[PDB]
Design a protein around this nucleic acid. Structure first.
Lengths: 35, 323, 49, 50
RNA sequence: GUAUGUCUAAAGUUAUGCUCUUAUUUACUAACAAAAUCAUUGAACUAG
RNA sequence: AAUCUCUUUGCCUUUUGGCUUAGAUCAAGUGUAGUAUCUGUUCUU
C-alpha cells in the first residue's frame, strides 16, 4: 500500500542527486582570486 | 607560399579485442601533436598535425615511414578531416585559414582566409565538395567548393551563442551535429539554418568532442565532467540513460574518443597520459593503458579494420600504437 | 499514478526562482572557466603564453 | 613535536567526526524528510524528546 | 509585451530485472495561430 | 604503563535568518510545437 512515509522516501531519493587541477602559477592566481 | 615533400599512389589499399600495450611509436610532431586520423575504410595511412605547423602522412604498415609532408600553415594545426573518397583532406589552423589538400600530390585545392579561428572542420559523407567550418566566433559556415560566388559560402548557421567546439556529420550526410562552448548540442539539416534538435540540461557540461557509433544508432560526446554521454540518432535524439562511460580525466582538454571497428568497444584519451577503453554494452571500464611521455593524450583513434590496433598522441609529440 | 508523480515532484521543491537560477548560473560559470583554461593550455603548449 | 601533536590531534578529531557523520547519514527511524538538512533537523527535533 | 541581465570570441603583439525501436498517456511552456451557423463589422488593439 | 573497536554521557558540529490585508487572488482552453513522462513489444543484460 502507498503511505505518506513511502511517498516522502521516494521524494528524498528523487532529490538526492568535475575535479579541475592547477597546472601553474597563473591558474593558481586565478583560483585564489576567485576564492 | 605552401611547400610539400615526398619520401616514398599510396592511397590504393596495399570481432574486435581489447588493446593491452603500446607496440610501437612514430616521431610525430616535436612541439606536440594536435590532430590524428586514420585513413577512412582501410586505415593503411595516418594523417597527423601538430604545433610545428606541419601535416604528415605516415604508413601504418611496412616500414612505418612518413610518406608525405605538407607545409602550408604559419601556426599550429587545429583540425584535420578526410573526405569520403580519401582523395582530399581538410586542414584548419590558428592562422585563421582552412586549406583543402590533395592527399596524393599535396597541392592545395582551396584556401579560405577566415576572420575567426576554425575550431573544427567537417566534410559531407555523400558529397566531397561540401564542407562545414565551426568558428570561435560561434558561427558555422557551409561551403561548396564548386560555387565561385562568395567563395562558395552557401550557408551560415548562427544559433550557437559561443565558440563552436566540435562538428560531426550523420553517416548519411543528411544531418550534422554541433557542440559549442555555450553548453548546448544542436542537430542541423544540411544547408538549412534551423536546428532540428537542441540538447541541453542543467547538469550537462559543454562537450568538446563528438563521434558516431559504428551502428549509426547513437552518437557519443566527451563532456567536461570527465564522462562520456550517448544520444540516440533517431528523431527526438534522447540521451541514453545507462550508456555512460566513466573513469578517465579530460576536464580542460579537448580529448577525442573513438569506437572499435565492430562497435563492440569505445575508447578515449586521458589527461594523465593514459588510454581508457570500455565495453559498449555495459559501459564497464576494461582497460587503461599507460602511454609514454607523461603528457596529456588528446588524440585517440581506432583502426577501421584491425581487431585491436589503436593510435594515440598528444603534447608529448610522438605518436603511439596500442594493441 | 500521475497524481502521485505530480505530488512527489511538488513535494520535492524547496528553492525559489532566484536560487535555482543561481544554481544553473554557477554551473555555466564553471563550464566557461574550464573552456577558458582549455584554450589557454592549448596556447601555452604551442609556446604562446 | 608540538606542531605534530596538534596536527595529529586535529586529524584524529576530524576523522572521528567524519565517521559520526556517515553513521548519522545512514541511520533510519526518524520522521520523514525530503533532503539531508531536513533529516538533520528532524533528528535535532527528536533529541528534544529525551 | 516589458523591466532588466548577460554575450559580442585577433593583434592596438611588452624582451625569458536493466535498456532500445516506436504508438500513446499526463504535466508544464509558447505576444506562435484571423479557426464555417447560432453585400460580408473582435481586429493591430492588453503588461508588474 | 601505550594502541584498536564498541556502548553510554557530553558536544549538534551543512541541525528552518524579518514585516502586511493567513500580503492578495487564481487553478474551465482549441490546434500545432517544445520538454519531461507512462503502458506495451522486441532488444540489451
Amino acid at each position: 500500500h502507498v503511505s505518506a512515509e513511502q511517498i516522502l522516501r521516494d521524494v528524498y531519493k528523487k532529490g538526492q542527486k568535475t575535479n579541475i587541477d592547477i597546472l601553474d602559477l597563473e591558474e593558481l592566481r586565478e583560483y585564489q582570486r576567485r576564492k | 607560399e605552401e611547400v610539400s615533400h615526398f619520401y616514398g599512389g599510396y592511397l590504393y589499399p596495399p570481432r574486435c579485442y581489447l588493446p593491452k600495450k603500446v607496440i610501437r611509436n612514430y616521431p610525430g610532431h616535436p612541439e606536440g601533436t594536435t590532430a590524428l586520423k586514420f585513413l577512412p575504410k582501410t586505415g593503411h595511412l595516418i594523417l597527423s598535425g601538430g604545433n610545428d605547423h606541419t601535416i604528415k602522412i605516415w604508413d601504418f604498415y611496412h616500414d612505418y615511414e612518413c610518406l608525405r609532408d605538407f607545409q602550408g600553415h604559419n601556426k599550429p594545426i587545429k583540425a584535420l578531416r578526410f573526405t569520403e573518397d580519401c582523395q582530399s583532406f581538410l586542414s584548419s589552423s590558428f592562422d585563421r585559414s582552412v586549406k583543402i589538400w590533395d592527399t596524393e600530390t599535396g597541392k592545395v585545392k582551396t584556401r579560405l582566409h577566415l576572420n575567426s579561428t576554425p575550431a573544427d572542420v567537417e566534410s559531407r559523407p555523400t558529397n566531397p565538395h561540401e564542407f562545414i567550418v565551426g568558428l570561435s566566433n560561434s558561427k558555422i559556415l557551409h561551403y561548396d567548393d564548386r560555387v565561385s560566388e562568395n567563395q562558395g559560402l552557401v550557408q551560415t548557421y548562427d544559433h550557437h551563442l559561443s565558440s563552436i567546439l566540435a562538428l560531426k556529420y550523420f553517416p548519411d550526410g543528411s544531418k550534422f551535429i554541433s557542440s559549442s562552448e555555450d553548453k548546448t548540442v544542436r542537430i542541423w539539416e544540411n544547408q538549412i539554418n534551423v536546428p532540428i534538435k537542441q540538447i541541453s540540461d542543467t547538469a550537462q557540461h559543454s562537450m568538446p568532442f563528438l563521434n558516431v557509433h559504428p551502428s549509426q544508432n547513437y552518437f557519443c560526446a566527451q563532456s567536461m565532467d570527465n564522462r562520456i554521454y550517448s544520444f540516440s540518432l533517431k528523431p527526438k535524439y534522447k540521451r541514453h540513460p545507462k550508456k555512460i562511460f566513466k573513469g578517465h580525466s579530460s576536464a580542460g582538454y579537448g580529448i577525442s574518443l573513438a569506437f572499435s571497428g565492430d562497435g563492440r568497444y569505445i575508447c578515449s584519451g586521458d589527461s594523465k597520459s593514459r588510454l581508457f577503453t570500455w565495453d559498449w554494452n555495459t559501459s564497464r571500464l576494461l582497460n587503461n593503458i599507460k602511454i609514454p611521455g607523461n603528457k596529456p593524450i588528446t588524440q585517440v583513434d581506432w583502426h577501421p579494420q584491425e581487431t585491436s590496433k589503436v593510435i594515440c598522441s598528444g603534447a608529448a609529440g610522438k605518436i603511439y600504437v596500442c594493441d | 499514478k500521475e497524481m502521485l508523480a505530480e505530488a512527489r515532484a511538488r513535494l520535492l521543491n524547496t528553492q525559489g526562482k532566484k536560487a535555482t537560477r543561481k544554481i544553473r548560473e554557477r554551473m555555466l560559470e564553471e563550464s566557461k572557466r574550464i573552456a577558458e583554461l582549455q584554450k589557454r593550455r592549448e596556447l601555452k603548449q604551442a609556446g604562446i603564453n | 613535536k608540538l606542531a605534530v601533536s596538534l596536527q595529529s590531534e586535529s586529524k584524529k578529531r576530524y576523522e572521528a567526526r567524519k565517521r559520526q557523520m556517515q553513521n548519522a547519514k545512514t541511520l533510519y527511524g526518524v520522521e520523514s524528510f525530503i533532503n539531508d538538512k531536513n533529516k538533520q533537523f528532524n533528528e535535532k527535533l527528536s533529541r528534544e524528546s529525551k
